[PDB]
Amino acid sequence: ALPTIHVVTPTYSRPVQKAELTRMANTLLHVPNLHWLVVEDAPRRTPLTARLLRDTGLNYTHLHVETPRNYIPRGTMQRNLALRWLRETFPRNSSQPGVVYFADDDNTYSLELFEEMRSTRRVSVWPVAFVGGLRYEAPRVNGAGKVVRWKTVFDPHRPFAIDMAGFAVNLRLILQRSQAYFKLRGVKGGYQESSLLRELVTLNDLEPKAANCTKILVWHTRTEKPVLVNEGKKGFTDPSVEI
Amino acid sequence: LPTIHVVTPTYSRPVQKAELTRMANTLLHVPNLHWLVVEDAPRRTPLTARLLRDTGLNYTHLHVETPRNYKLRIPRGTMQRNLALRWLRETFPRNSSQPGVVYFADDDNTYSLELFEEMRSTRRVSVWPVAFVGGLRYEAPRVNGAGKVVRWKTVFDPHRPFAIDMAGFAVNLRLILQRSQAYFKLRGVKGGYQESSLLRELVTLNDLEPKAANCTKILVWHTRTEKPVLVNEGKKGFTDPSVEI
Ligand SMILES: CC(=O)N[C@@H]1[C@@H](O)[C@H](O[C@@H]2O[C@H](CO)[C@H](O)[C@H](O)[C@H]2O)[C@@H](CO)O[C@@H]1O
Ligand SMILES: CC(=O)N[C@@H]1[C@@H](O)[C@H](O[C@@H]2O[C@H](CO)[C@H](O)[C@H](O)[C@H]2O)[C@@H](CO)O[C@H]1O
Ligand SMILES: O=c1ccn([C@@H]2O[C@H](COP(=O)(O)OP(=O)(O)O)[C@@H](O)[C@H]2O)c(=O)[nH]1
Ligand SMILES: O=c1ccn([C@@H]2O[C@H](COP(=O)(O)OP(=O)(O)O)[C@@H](O)[C@H]2O)c(=O)[nH]1
Ligand SMILES: [Mn+2]
Ligand SMILES: [Mn+2]
Numbered sequence: 001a002l003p004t005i006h007v008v009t010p011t012y013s014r015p016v017q018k019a020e021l022t023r024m025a026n027t028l029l030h031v032p033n034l035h036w037l038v039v040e041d042a043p044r045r046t047p048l049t050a051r052l053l054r055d056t057g058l059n060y061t062h063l064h065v066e067t068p069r070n071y072i073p074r075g076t077m078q079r080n081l082a083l084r085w086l087r088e089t090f091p092r093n094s095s096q097p098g099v100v101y102f103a104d105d106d107n108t109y110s111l112e113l114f115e116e117m118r119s120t121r122r123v124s125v126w127p128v129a130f131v132g133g134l135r136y137e138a139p140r141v142n143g144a145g146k147v148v149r150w151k152t153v154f155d156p157h158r159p160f161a162i163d164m165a166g167f168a169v170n171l172r173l174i175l176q177r178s179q180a181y182f183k184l185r186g187v188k189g190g191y192q193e194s195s196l197l198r199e200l201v202t203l204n205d206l207e208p209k210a211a212n213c214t215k216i217l218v219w220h221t222r223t224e225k226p227v228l229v230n231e232g233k234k235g236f237t238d239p240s241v242e243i
Numbered sequence: 244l245p246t247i248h249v250v251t252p253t254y255s256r257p258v259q260k261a262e263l264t265r266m267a268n269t270l271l272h273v274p275n276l277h278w279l280v281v282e283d284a285p286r287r288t289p290l291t292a293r294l295l296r297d298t299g300l301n302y303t304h305l306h307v308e309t310p311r312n313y314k315l316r317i318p319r320g321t322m323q324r325n326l327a328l329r330w331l332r333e334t335f336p337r338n339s340s341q342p343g344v345v346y347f348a349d350d351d352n353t354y355s356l357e358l359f360e361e362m363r364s365t366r367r368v369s370v371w372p373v374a375f376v377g378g379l380r381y382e383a384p385r386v387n388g389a390g391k392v393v394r395w396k397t398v399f400d401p402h403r404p405f406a407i408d409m410a411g412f413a414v415n416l417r418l419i420l421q422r423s424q425a426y427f428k429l430r431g432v433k434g435g436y437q438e439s440s441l442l443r444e445l446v447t448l449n450d451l452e453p454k455a456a457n458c459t460k461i462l463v464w465h466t467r468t469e470k471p472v473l474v475n476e477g478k479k480g481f482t483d484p485s486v487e488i
Contacts, residue, residue, distance in 0.1 A: 015380070018352035019464035026269040026356065099445035108261040111268065133475030135257070135482045151482075153475035216488045219261035230378030230398035237396070243374045243381055243459045 003034045003097035003118050006086065006171065006220040010078030011049065011105045012041035015226050018048060018243060020105045025056045031114045036060040037085070039078035041067050048242060061085065072184045073192045075104065080181045087178050089223040092169065098171030106223050107172045113217040116209040117168035129167040131222040137162060138213045139206065147206040147213075157193040160203075165218050167193070173200050197199075244275045245342035245363050248416065250327040252320030252352045253291065254283040257471050260290060260488060262350045267298045271325040275357045279330070282306040290487055304329060305422075316427060318437050320349065325426045332423055335416065343416030347409050351468050352408075358462040361454040362413035368446045370461035371455035373411040382407065384451070384458045392451040404439040405448075410463050412438070418445055 006140035007028065011017060021038075028034055036058050040049055053060045064212050065081040074110060081100055086100065099120045103109065117124050125147060127138035132154035139162065140149035150161035160167075172178070210217050249270065253259060263280075270276055282291055295468050307326040309317070319368045324347055324350075328347060335341060344365045348354065362369050368391060372383035377399040380435045384407065385394040395406035419425070428440040455462050 015375070016464070016466055018461075019466050022355055022464075023265050023269060027265060028271065029272065039414055071308050108265045127485060129261070129488045130257070130471040133472050135471075135473055135488050136486070138482075153481055191269070214486070216260075216486065218260070219256060219264075219488070220471075221261050221470075224467035224469050226375040226380075226465075226467075228379050228380060229261065231380060236398055237380045238385075241372075241383075241459065241461065242379070243464070 001097070002033045002097050004035050004121075005118060006035045006037055006082075006098055006100045008037045008039070008082040008100065008102045009042060009078055009105055010075030012037050012211050013048070015228070015243065016223050017105075019053065019210075020194040020223065021049065021052055023051070024103075024105055024109075025058060027109050027111070028058060029056065034114070035080045035225050038062050039082050040064040041075070041078055042146055061130065066077065067073060072187060073099075073182075073189075076182050076184045080184070083174060083181055085172055090175055092175045092178065093227060094171075094175065099168050100171055100174055104164065106221060107165050108219040108221045110217045116217065120168050120170050122173060122207065123197065123204050124169055124207040124209050125162060125167045125213070126208070126218070127144075127213050127216050128163045128218055128220055129173065129216045130222075131163040133167075134170065136216050137166070139166075139208060141208045141212045145208060145212060147208055148166040149205055155190055162193055163220060165195070165220060167206075169200060183223055214232060244342055245365075246275045246341055246416075247273065247359055247363055247413075248279055248327075248331065249279045250279045250324055250345060250347045252281050252323030255290070257346065257488065258474070259350075260294065262468065263291070263294055265310055265347075266350055266354075267294070267300060269356070270300055270355050271298065272356050276301065276359070279327045279458040280304055280328050281320075283309050283320065283323055283347050302455050303330070308471045308485060316434060318427070321427050321429060321437070328419065328426055331416065331419055335420055335422070337420045341416065344413050345416055345419050346413040349409065351466060352410050353464040353466045355462045358455075363461065365413050365415050365452060366412050367418055367452060368403075368412055368442065369452040370407055370412045370452045371453070371463070372410045372457070372458055372461050373463050373465055374461045375467075376408040376411075377406075381461050382411070384411075384453055386457055387454045388459070390453065392448055392453055400434060403436055407438055408433045408465060410465060412442070414415040414445060414463055479487060 129136040137152045139147045152161045180199040271450045370384045374381040384392045387393045397406045425444040
């Protein structure tokens, strides 16, 4: 009966990738009924990602799709591939409860976050730290427990002024709205979340989590680029040793 | 199953809670682990105290403020690591045959679960490769056919006593207790020689124990976290300062 949480994680090859996937997997290993949908931004599945997923024992699906020359946001085509995979895997009126969460590989997630999104009926929302040039963004909730706006500074007029890591969607809505995908073509920066949510739910139907959006359970952390200046042009370390 | 005493210096800054949260999520998987969190502050902060209590991990919350004056060449977290060393020596009798290992783990690095099992059996001092240090993809101890460390594969001062990062070694607790005068140096050592300053008083190259498949695998990464952009907070502030992040 416990709903399955489908975590959609776009990822790409770069120095810190294995470290990012490692601490993220260490977090996900604590969550029951979790399906990790990892979509690599590559022409084919890489052995690094394949072996890491295999060794964790986690329930996962490993997909891949390469981003076009112009590299629109980041991770878009990968999240869209995952949405299509879900629709091809689960029938529109499926009865198996599920929740979909788009979790980037560098963010920091608390275990409480997953407990909060698991009961999502339509779309749930919560505060996100380190987004929109603020300590955190948070949906505005009235005393009745309804979402009536957003507490942000960056373009507060977007239909859904919230970051990718700030909401989850019941799988049923994703299957019913079979044509709803993240916009990549004519897309204003910061409107990717709205491009999808607008087609799935209305403001008044959002389900505020994290004690009526007063607590921060997820952080939009960024990882610094490692300095590899000492490798030189010919390289110093063994290129066959995986990092 | 030997207890692993993880020494983690930490300080108040925007990403602190996040760093401790994802680190706790990793540590929660490790059995017989004692987390020695040492805050760089005048007193234990409610944020850290609450987080440690909520994790369910076995921990000891200590604190020592690095003089404001000092921060204005003293390696980050030095005084905090030394406070933990002193605490271990004042808590555990020099002789008791208590199986344990000490590991200095900074709050922003990335650790694999396999790393802890590799260091848990340490008899003296164990060493292993560390990614993203010394301007390289990784630094790795060099081992000979006899199974002994005979040098270090690095570009930055590979000829120093111990050319290895803080996250690349662990010390048997008994050894820490025996060498009661061994602490990280505060001043007098060249940049990048603090790890050597301590290790040289603890062991010789020949007594090192190579881990991580004879130092051929990377099980720990010296990752660093970017500073969050808070420009939209303005001068007077936008978000509620009472809301913990
Ligand atoms: C580009 C470069 O060579 N950088 C080096 C630093 O790596 C070095 O910092 C030390 O590096 C060692 C590596 O084993 C440890 O990580 C140690 O903790 C670091 O202090 C500094 C030393 O002053 O020199 C250059 O910056
Ligand atoms: C300092 C500042 O205002 N920066 C903004 C970015 O925040 C913004 O990025 C978008 O931010 C929203 C926040 O809810 C969300 O994280 C989106 O995913 C993200 O794209 C960017 C838009 O291109 O403009 C900057 O100026
Ligand atoms: O070419 C790229 C750049 C990013 N990503 C992934 O898509 C998400 C976008 O995150 P990143 O740019 O950190 O996002 P930011 O922090 O800039 O919002 C993360 O899971 C990345 O691993 C990707 O697949 N391909
Ligand atoms: O004023 C400070 C700066 C850092 N630290 C801690 O000491 C370690 C040093 O790390 P940081 O500078 O990242 O180290 P670097 O990546 O520069 O080696 C980390 O556990 C920090 O939380 C601290 O206690 N006080
Ligand atoms: Mn990111
Ligand atoms: Mn660090």
